[PDB]
Amino acid sequence: MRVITLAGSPRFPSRSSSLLEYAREKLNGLDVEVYHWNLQNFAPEDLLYARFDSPALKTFTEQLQQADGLIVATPVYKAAYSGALKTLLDLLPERALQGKVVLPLATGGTVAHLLAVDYALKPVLSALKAQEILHGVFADDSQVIDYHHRPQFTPNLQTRLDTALETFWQALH
Amino acid sequence: MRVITLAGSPRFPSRSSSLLEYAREKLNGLDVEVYHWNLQNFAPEDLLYARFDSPALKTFTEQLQQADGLIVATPVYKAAYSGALKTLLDLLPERALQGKVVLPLATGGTVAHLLAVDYALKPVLSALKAQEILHGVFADDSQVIDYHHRPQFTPNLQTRLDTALETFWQALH
Amino acid sequence: MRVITLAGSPRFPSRSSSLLEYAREKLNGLDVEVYHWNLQNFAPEDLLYARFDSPALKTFTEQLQQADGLIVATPVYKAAYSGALKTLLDLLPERALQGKVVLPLATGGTVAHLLAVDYALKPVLSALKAQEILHGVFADDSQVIDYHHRPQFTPNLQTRLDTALETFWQALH
Amino acid sequence: MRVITLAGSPRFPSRSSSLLEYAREKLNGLDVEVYHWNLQNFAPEDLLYARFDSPALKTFTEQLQQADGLIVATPVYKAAYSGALKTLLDLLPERALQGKVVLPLATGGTVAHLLAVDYALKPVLSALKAQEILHGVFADDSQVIDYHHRPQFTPNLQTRLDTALETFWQALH
Ligand SMILES: Cc1cc2nc3c(=O)[nH]c(=O)nc-3n(C[C@H](O)[C@H](O)[C@H](O)COP(=O)(O)O)c2cc1C
Ligand SMILES: Cc1cc2nc3c(=O)[nH]c(=O)nc-3n(C[C@H](O)[C@H](O)[C@H](O)COP(=O)(O)O)c2cc1C
Ligand SMILES: Cc1cc2nc3c(=O)[nH]c(=O)nc-3n(C[C@H](O)[C@H](O)[C@H](O)COP(=O)(O)O)c2cc1C
Ligand SMILES: Cc1cc2nc3c(=O)[nH]c(=O)nc-3n(C[C@H](O)[C@H](O)[C@H](O)COP(=O)(O)O)c2cc1C
Hints:
The structure is a homotetramer.
Chain A: E1 2-7, H1 15-29, E2 33-38, H2 44-48, H3 55-66, E3 69-75, H4 83-89, E4 101-108, H5 116-127, E5 132-134, E6 137-140, E7 144-146, E8 152-153, H6 155-171
Helix pairs in contact in A: 1-6
Bound molecules: flavin mononucleotide (4 copies).
One flavin mononucleotide sits between chains A (9, 11, 14-17, 75-79, 107-110, 113, 141) and C (50, 90, 127).
């Protein structure tokens, strides 16, 4: 019914955010209230100094609470998720994703770090008590032909995105 | 509705198996067809030398394929799942858990090894292409009052098993 | 000969930093040039927006290059290292720890997350090509009796610290 | 100087074993006493049913204890080390690798599973109390030109093995 999408790259434009964009598009047809957030909606001072009286944190935290699902995207940095993304996750309440379906998306420079999603990001999402976590979609940088403007992907990436998004849509019932 | 239960303990009875026995009991209550497998169903030489023509592997494989969901249980050895269970997972086809809901259970000598589920078992189950992986249940040995004659758990662990099984049943629609 | 120490908690005072403090003390006797850094030496805007033209980054990056070793401390947040710490690590060059001995220290609220060091922090340090990574020291919050003033630890924690620091000192030759 | 080499592959000859054979050869060149073990030294039933009275386990254990360092090699199965190797690691005493330098080697069908070394194998070796764990070497199968009759590697992989072995030898002082 409601879905939070969360872009986790500190950079803009972002290759991994182009994956969230295609997802957002897909849902915006199916009349689902999609609330999109990126790191630029928070004050860097709040995230870095772990400040829970953050006003932006509160609004986000509120909107998450009412969400049925989360789609979250990260670049791979040093074989794991972005630090930047993590600093926000660290401010969520202990059971923040209790009862929600979670779909993780990632882009990375090398195929050699495909496993960063399963080994690094999923356990954090799980510590936040995600009720179920989908297989997810990792894409190396060669899969994204264009993102500065409209996202363009190889049919392989697009198809895998499609499949995941279909599974997520079903799981939200 | 078909579910496979898979005991990953090298000994029998085990603490981790008592969790599956309790699971079996609750799912039979709902007219799910439950099929139990343990490591004692395979010849040690077939698993330890990765022999793909193992007759039991072919039977397990046909059974898994027809199954809608999998509950797998392991003890926690050296900060991970058991090698023993892993010998069998290594012999399954590449997409063996595609289209399937997976619930992982585990028991551990110390709470210090709780992260073994998220950081070690889950990524293996995801390499097999599990469609979705539930939060799961970890119990340190002190929560399993009896695993020999009748599964008996502390109230907290029994409540967490029930919450997990209810989520797992709902997922199978 | 030279050692970087790096406090990774966004908070001050810090329980995990008290572990670095005892380490710093230990080395300051043995005439080793110890360069200490915490996250407060960087601008939160630089870390969050991934800015490599950071002046503080340069100085740190320079001092690391000449260091024989790194001792790094993190609180456990959401079953992994701090996001805050990670945002700095993400700005280091790809082979930043090539040729260095690395000792990781951590404090966490629950024993249940002892494995966050080995499963989450070590692989990042390794992606940065640490030449060798020591076993490390994890301490749950009950081990630290006092840190607002002088650090006070249980003899168990202190002894394990001692042992690790001895091993690190030897490895720096 | 005593080193144990331990082949974790369930088949022989294996790609991962060719790395150890090359290692053996280089260390004998330096009058290190090298002791090679593989899974074929143990009875499959002892490993798969965790039987502690395995005579070979007692011999391996005495040998490990007297050893200064360990080089262990595994193929990468389902995003991790082999279950087969893990069955043997599960049977070693709690502090088996205390006081020891460990070098991990691995080979994989795809570069996509490179993180199996850091995210899966290393935490197991650290649960055994390895004093220090070197960066190690991962090679995808395409880097091993021959493992049957004479180990032959691409120049890049041979250079990385040499760098690792030189670090390992230096560590043994
Ligand atoms: C600071 C930084 C660190 C990176 N480290 C890795 C890495 O460890 N492994 C990898 O495969 N790619 C690495 N890359 C490449 C990115 O993960 C890749 O280009 C990704 O698509 C960027 O996504 P984004 O546009 O959303 O930032 C790194 C990139 C940056 C900027
Ligand atoms: C060979 C062996 C190794 C073990 N290593 C660990 C360990 O590393 N960490 C831990 O928490 N418990 C360890 N234990 C204890 C088991 O995790 C715990 O007692 C478990 O519940 C036994 O489960 P089972 O009866 O299903 O086999 C080990 C037990 C055995 C037999
Ligand atoms: C934002 C936040 C998240 C935390 N999450 C966890 C956690 O997942 N697991 C845990 O054991 N402790 C958790 N804790 C407790 C801390 O890890 C623990 O109190 C630690 O000693 C703090 O160290 P520091 O003073 O250096 O910040 C968390 C604490 C904070 C402030
Ligand atoms: C049962 C089995 C499972 C495998 N699964 C994977 C895998 O999940 N990921 C991967 O990268 N390679 C996988 N492979 C390929 C091996 O990782 C690769 O070919 C390896 O180098 C074989 O090493 P070995 O000859 O030392 O046994 C698998 C091979 C076998 C026999």
